[PDB]
C-alpha cells in the first residue's frame, strides 16, 4: 500500500530498508522528473473561450510546471481554437520572479495572454489563476495530469505538497520548494530552496506544527506559499516580505556572503528591502550590520549574487548606491 | 554553487499502488511496527551513570520505574543483570527485578536525575505509581540506539523518536511503536492505526501535521495515550476512544466490520460506552450491533483475543452484561 525500498543516510551513517513514505527532493533533481499535462486539451480550449467571452484577458500560472505546460500546449490550443471557429490568438510567454496571482478564474485581432511580463492592457485583476488541480499520475520521468478545479480558492494544489520530520530534521516540500528545519538548541528554519516563487497559500493540512503561529514571525511569508508553521521561524528575523523573491529561483540559508561580514549593533540602519552585496558596477560591499538579528546572517543566493535578509543593512556604505529588491 | 546537499536520506523506492518507481534524496519514514525482526535496539551509554541515578532515585525515596516506550522495557530486561552487578560491587542492598508489560504503559510521577527496585510488572500499592520514575531517558545518537539520562521532567514523548509525513494525500504519524495512517477520500480522516505499545505521554505538536483547530474531544486516539493533536486524528461520527480496548497493549485499529457481525445506524441504539468484544467469554459470537450517529465502516480494533468495536458501537439486541468489556 505504501512506498517500499531502500535508503542510505550519509550523515546518520546507516542503511535502512523497509516500507513507508519517501519524500524526495524534487528541486535539486538533475532532470525534469515531472511534467504537467492536461487530461483534455479540448476542454481547456472550451473554458478559455468562456474566459475570454466573460472579459478574462489572460491567465497567470501558479507553479512553474504550469507555465511550461502552457508552452508545450499552445500550438494545439490554437489549432483546436482555429478549427472551432473563433478569432482569438493565444501566446504564452516566460516567467518573471514571483508568479503573481490573478483575481479571476476558469470554470469547468484579439489576443489572450498567458503569463509573460506585466501589463496594463491585461492586468492581474482580469487574469485567471489557480484553476488546475491534479487528476492522477503516469510512471517512469513521470506524467502529472491536470484538470479544471471545481472551486476558486487561494490554496496551492495539495496533491503536490508533502512534509516530513525525523531525526529532528523537518522538511516542507513541493514541486518547486524545499524547506528544511532542524533542532539545534531550538527549532528554527535552516535552508530553503526555490525554483519558483508562487503566490498561493500553503494548506495547513500539509503543515507541521501549525498551531499558535504568528504571520509576523514566519520567515517565508504566508503570501508566497510560506508554510504557516513554527518550523518557519528564525530567532531575530521577521517576515521577509521584501526579500529578493523577484529572483524567482534562489537559495536561502544562514551564512555570510562571500567576502562580507555582519556585526550586531544598535547603531545599524533599520530593516528595509533586501539589498545585494555587489553594486551594479561589480564593487563588493564588505561591511554589514543588523539591529537585533541573530548570527549567522540570513542570506539568499541567486543567479546574480548574494543578498541579505531584510534587517541586514550596509554598515558604512550609503544604501542609495546599492541594488535592492523593490522590483516591479 | 558547488555544494552537495545530501544531509538527508538518499536511495530508491517503488510504490505498489501508485505503480511508479522513484529515486532521489529526501526523508524516508519507515514503518518500525510491522517489522518481522527487531530493527532497533535500546542501549544505555553508561550503565554506571544509570546506577548512580538508581541509587540517587531510591535515596530520593523512589521504589521503582515504569517504562514509557516498549523498547525501554525490553532494554530494562537485557540490562538488569549488569545493573545489579555494579550495585553488588558498590554493595548497596537493593535488588532490581523487572517484569513484563501490562496493557497501557502507565505514567509515573517521579523521575531519575542525571550526573527491591521494581521495573514494570503489574501494579501494586506497596510501590504505587506515585513513587515510580517515568520518562527520564532521551536519545543521544545512533542498527543501534543509545540512550542517556534526561534533563527536565515533562510529559512529552521523546521527540527524537517521532516522525510524520504526508504525500499524495496519504498521511502518517509514526513512532517506535505507533503507526497512524490518515487519508483523503472526500474528506481527511484516519483509516488505520497500529500499536505495539500504548503509552501515556503527549505527542509533541512539533511532530504533528495539521495541529491547528483541533478539539481534543474529536481526536480518535486520545491525547492522553500519545494521540497526535491533529485533524488527521479524526473520523466523522466518532469521538475520543477514551475507553477503547487499550488494555490489549498490542492492537490493530481500523474501519471495517468485525468478522461475522453487522453494524446498523439507529437512534434506538445505546449511548457510547466502554468498548465491547464480539465474542462472549464462552466463545459465542454476537452478530447484531448498532451505533447511534457513527459513520460506517465501524471503528474496530483487533487484538490477541478477538475483535472489539469502537465506543459508539453497541449490541443491537444482546444485553451488554453478557459481553466482555474493557473496564
Amino acid at each position, epitope marked *: 500500500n505504501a512506498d517500499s525500498g531502500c535508503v542510505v543516510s550519509w550523515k546518520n551513517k546507516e542503511l535502512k530498508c523497509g516500507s513507508g513514505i519517501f519524500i524526495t527532493d524534487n528541486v535539486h533533481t538533475w532532470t525534469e522528473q515531472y511534467k504537467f499535462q492536461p487530461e483534455s486539451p479540448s476542454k481547456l480550449a472550451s473554458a478559455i473561450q468562456k474566459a475570454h467571452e466573460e472579459g478574462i484577458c489572460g491567465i497567470r500560472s501558479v507553479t512553474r510546471l504550469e507555465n511550461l505546460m502552457w508552452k508545450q500546449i499552445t500550438p494545439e490550443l490554437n489549432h483546436i481554437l482555429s478549427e472551432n471557429e473563433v478569432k482569438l490568438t493565444i501566446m504564452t510567454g516566460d516567467i518573471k520572479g514571483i508568479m503573481q496571482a490573478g483575481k479571476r478564474s476558469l470554470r469547468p485581432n484579439q489576443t489572450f495572454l498567458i503569463d509573460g511580463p506585466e501589463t496594463a492592457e491585461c492586468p492581474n485583476t482580469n487574469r485567471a489563476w489557480n484553476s488546475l488541480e491534479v487528476e492522477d499520475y503516469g510512471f517512469g520521468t513521470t506524467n502529472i495530469w491536470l484538470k479544471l478545479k471545481e472551486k476558486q480558492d487561494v490554496f496551492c494544489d495539495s496533491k503536490l505538497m508533502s512534509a516530513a520530520i525525523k531525526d529532528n530534521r523537518a522538511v516542507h516540500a513541493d514541486m518547486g520548494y524545499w524547506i528544511e528545519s532542524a533542532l539545534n538548541d531550538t527549532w528554527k528554519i535552516e535552508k530553503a530552496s526555490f525554483i519558483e516563487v508562487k503566490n498561493c497559500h500553503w494548506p495547513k493540512s500539509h503543515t507541521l506544527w501549525s498551531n499558535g503561529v504568528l504571520e509576523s514571525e514566519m520567515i517565508i511569508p504566508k503570501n508566497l506559499a510560506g508554510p504557516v508553521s513554527q518550523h518557519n521561524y528564525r530567532p531575530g528575523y521577521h517576515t521577509q516580505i521584501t526579500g529578493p523573491w523577484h529572483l524567482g529561483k534562489l537559495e536561502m540559508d544562514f551564512d555570510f556572503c*562571500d567576502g562580507t561580514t555582519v556585526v550586531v549593533t544598535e547603531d545599524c540602519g533599520n530593516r528595509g528591502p533586501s539589498l545585494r552585496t*555587489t553594486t*551594479a*558596477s*561589480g564593487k563588493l560591499i564588505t561591511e554589514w550590520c543588523c539591529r537585533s538579528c541573530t548570527l549567522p546572517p540570513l542570506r539568499y543566493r541567486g*543567479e*546574480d*549574487g548574494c543578498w541579505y535578509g531584510m534587517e541586514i543593512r550596509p554598515l558604512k556604505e550609503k544604501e542609495e548606491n546599492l*541594488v535592492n529588491s523593490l522590483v516591479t | 554553487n558547488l555544494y552537495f546537499q545530501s544531509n538527508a536520506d538518499s536511495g530508491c523506492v517503488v510504490s505498489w499502488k501508485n505503480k511508479e518507481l522513484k529515486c532521489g534524496s529526501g526523508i524516508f519514514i519507515t514503518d518500525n511496527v510491522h517489522t518481522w525482526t527487531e530493527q532497533y535496539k535500546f542501549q544505555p551509554e553508561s550503565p554506571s551513570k544509570l546506577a548512580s541515578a538508581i541509587q540517587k532515585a531510591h535515596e530520593e525515596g523512589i521504589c521503582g520505574i515504569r517504562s514509557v516506550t516498549r523498547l525501554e522495557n525490553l532494554m530494562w530486561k537485557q540490562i538488569t543483570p549488569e545493573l545489579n552487578h555494579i550495585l553488588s560491587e558498590n554493595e548497596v542492598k537493593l535488588t532490581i527485578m523487572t517484569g513484563d508489560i501490562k496493557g497501557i504503559m502507565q505514567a509515573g510521577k517521579r523521575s531519575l536525575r542525571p550526573q527491591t527496585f521494581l521495573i514494570d510488572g503489574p501494579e501494586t500499592a506497596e510501590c504505587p505509581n506515585t513513587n515510580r520514575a517515568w520518562n527520564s531517558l532521551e536519545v543521544e545518537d545512533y542498527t543501534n540506539i543509545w540512550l542517556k539520562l534526561k534533563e527536565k521532567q515533562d510529559v512529552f514523548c521523546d521527540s527524537k523518536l517521532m516522525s510524520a509525513a504526508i504525500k499524495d494525500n496519504r498521511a502518517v504519524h509514526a513512532d517506535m511503536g505507533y503507526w497512524i495512517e490518515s487519508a483523503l477520500n472526500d474528506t481527511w480522516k484516519i483509516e488505520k492505526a497500529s500499536f505495539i505499545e500504548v503509552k501515556n505521554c503527549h505527542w509533541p505538536k512539533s511532530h504533528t501535521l495539521w495541529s491547528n483547530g483541533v478539539l481534543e474531544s474529536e481526536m480518535i486516539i486520545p491525547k492522553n495515550l500519545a494521540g497526535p493533536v491533529s485533524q488527521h486524528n479524526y473520523r466523522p461520527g466518532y469521538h475520543t476512544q477514551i475507553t477503547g480496548p487499550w488494555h490489549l497493549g498490542k492492537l490493530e485499529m481500523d474501519f471495517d466490520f468485525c468478522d461475522g457481525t453487522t453494524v446498523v445506524v439507529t437512534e434506538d441504539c445505546g449511548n457510547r460506552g466502554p468498548s465491547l468484544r464480539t465474542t462472549t467469554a464462552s466463545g459465542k459470537l454476537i452478530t447484531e450491533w448498532c451505533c447511534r450517529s457513527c459513520t460506517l465502516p465501524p471503528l474496530r480494533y483487533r487484538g490477541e483475543d478477538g475483535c472489539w468495536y469502537g465506543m459508539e458501537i453497541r449490541p443491537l439486541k444482546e444485553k451488554e452484561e453478557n459481553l466482555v468489556n474493557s473496564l
Partner: single-chain antibody
Framework: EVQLQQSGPELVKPGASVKMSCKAS????????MHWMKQKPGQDLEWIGY????????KYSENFKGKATLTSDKSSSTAFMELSSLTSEDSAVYYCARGYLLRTGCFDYWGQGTTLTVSSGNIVLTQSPASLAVSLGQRATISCRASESVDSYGYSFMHWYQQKPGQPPKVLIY???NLESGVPARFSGSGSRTDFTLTIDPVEADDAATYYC?????????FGAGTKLELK
C-alpha cells in the same frame, strides 16, 4: 587590475576533443568569474559560459551543454574549457574574459584569445548598421535594440565593446551610458529599456574597429552581430 593568460593556438582534427586554459591573476573569491566566448572568423561573439575557480560555480548557455565542459584548479586559479566532439563549425577564436554574476559589471579584462582551427590537412540584440564607413571628424552612430528590456534595479545592463583586428574587445561604455576609465569622451552611449545608441563624435584615426553591444540582464548573455566601422 586583472590579467588573463590564455593557452597557445591549437590545430585539431575533426572528431577529436580540445582542452584550452586561462590563468587568472589578481582575482578574489568574490569576483573572478571567468566567462568564455566563441568568435567565428570576423563574426559575432557567442557566450559559452563561466566558471569561478575558487567556487567552482559554473554555468553554460544552452547551445553549449553538449559541447563545452568547464573545469578548474583553485591552486593556480586556472579555468579549463574542453570542447567534446569537434567539427569545423567549432573553428573560432575563443576568448576568456573576467566578468561577474548575472546583473553585474561587464567584461572588465580580456585574454588574448585562443585560435582553434578544425581541419584535416533569450534576449536578442540587433545591431545597426552591419558595416559603416565614415570620414575623419564626422559622427558615427551605432544602435542596438534588445528584444526585451535589459533594465533591472534602475540600471540598463547594456555595454559597448570596440574590437580592433587581431585583438580582444575592449570596454568603452558600461551600464548603457558610463565611460570606462581612460576612454575618450568623444565616445558616448545612451538609451534605456530596449533601445540604445553608441555615438562616436568626432571619429578619429584610431577609431577604425568592429563594435559590439552586449547585455547581462538575463541568461544567456548575448551579443550584437557587430558593426564594422571603416575610415575614408
Amino acid at each position: 587590475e586583472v590579467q588573463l593568460q590564455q593557452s597557445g593556438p591549437e590545430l585539431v582534427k575533426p572528431g577529436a576533443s580540445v582542452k584550452m586554459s586561462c590563468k587568472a591573476s589578481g582575482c578574489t573569491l568574490t569576483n573572478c568569474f571567468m566567462h568564455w566566448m566563441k568568435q567565428k572568423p570576423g563574426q559575432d561573439l557567442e557566450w559559452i559560459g563561466y566558471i569561478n575557480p575558487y567556487n567552482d560555480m559554473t554555468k553554460y548557455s544552452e547551445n553549449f551543454k553538449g559541447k563545452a565542459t568547464l573545469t578548474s584548479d583553485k591552486s593556480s586559479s586556472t579555468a579549463f574549457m574542453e570542447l567534446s566532439s569537434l567539427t569545423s563549425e567549432d573553428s573560432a577564436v575563443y576568448y576568456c574574459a573576467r566578468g561577474y554574476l548575472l546583473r553585474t559589471g561587464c567584461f572588465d579584462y580580456w585574454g588574448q584569445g585562443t585560435t582553434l582551427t578544425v581541419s584535416s590537412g533569450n534576449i536578442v540584440l540587433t545591431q545597426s548598421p552591419a558595416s559603416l564607413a565614415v570620414s575623419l571628424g564626422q559622427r558615427a552612430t551605432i544602435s542596438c535594440r534588445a528584444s526585451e528590456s535589459v533594465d533591472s534595479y534602475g540600471y540598463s545592463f547594456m555595454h559597448w565593446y570596440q574590437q580592433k583586428p587581431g585583438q580582444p574587445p575592449k570596454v568603452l561604455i558600461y551600464l548603457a551610458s558610463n565611460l570606462e576609465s581612460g576612454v575618450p569622451a568623444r565616445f558616448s552611449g545612451s538609451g534605456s529599456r530596449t533601445d540604445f545608441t553608441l555615438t562616436i563624435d568626432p571619429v578619429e584615426a584610431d577609431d577604425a574597429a568592429t563594435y559590439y553591444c552586449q547585455q547581462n540582464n538575463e541568461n544567456p548573455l548575448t551579443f550584437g552581430a557587430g558593426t564594422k566601422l571603416e575610415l575614408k
